[PDB]
Amino acid sequence: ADEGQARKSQLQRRFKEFLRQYRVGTDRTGFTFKYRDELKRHYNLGEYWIEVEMEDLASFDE
């Protein structure tokens, strides 16, 4: 019960560091923050939805 919210406050913090840190592209060309940019560009348009991809989530934190 008391460990429930204490786990959650540690998952809701590792799901947040995924959106905030996941990048694409290599080092030769240049990078791109994939989900911050889509969050911003979908919020400013007034859409309020991102499309997370499960392969990315897997490759960041298994």
Next chain:
Amino acid sequence: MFVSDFRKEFYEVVQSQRVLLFVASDVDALCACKILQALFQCDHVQYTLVPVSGWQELETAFLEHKEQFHYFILINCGANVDLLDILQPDEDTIFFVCDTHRPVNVVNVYNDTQIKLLIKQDDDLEVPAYEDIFRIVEQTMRRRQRREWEARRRDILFDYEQYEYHGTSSAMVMFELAWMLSKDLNDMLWWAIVGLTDQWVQDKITQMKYVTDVGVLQRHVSRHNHRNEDEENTLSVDCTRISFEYDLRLVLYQH
């Protein structure tokens, strides 16, 4: 001839010139080029890359460029046949050969002016000695002995040119060169590893030789990637890492 050292005999001659690179079509030769490229774009050496596919196209390519340039480099082509005749070049043109095919043709070995070989001689080579294959009654009495010599030659040829095989990959000779100059990187190490793995994939070398070469390359891999001993937590995740694996023989099972 045989190039004794690659620094002061192959590189520092073409360092100030305009070379022309002929390239065969196999993963070994691609990975043997992509290192020489990166070794030329680092010292501002004007080259030119001609992709050939046979002997007819190599001859056609040599037809057109044979007056502008007078340096050449052949990569995985033209070490098992004779060169000074199929191309019929001039005298002041130089050829470098960095091929894997075996055995090296005879005349290409006793021609120390125009066809230099970047082939490390500590491979499985047993080239016959020089005069064994190259040049009144007493006249006939001795020309019969020369006829005996020719008869021995007709046999020792058949002894030497009867089996074809492959030596150390090109992309490992080039990497030895690129390490001598102290200008090696990971990107030039991955191409070495790929140019070696390809021979074993296409089954052109023996398992003994493959494991020997892997044993060689692992020292380099550990020299580069071990320098990150405990700082692997403060190294950029977006920076290539090569690692030694003892892994399955299934093909493409990770995709």
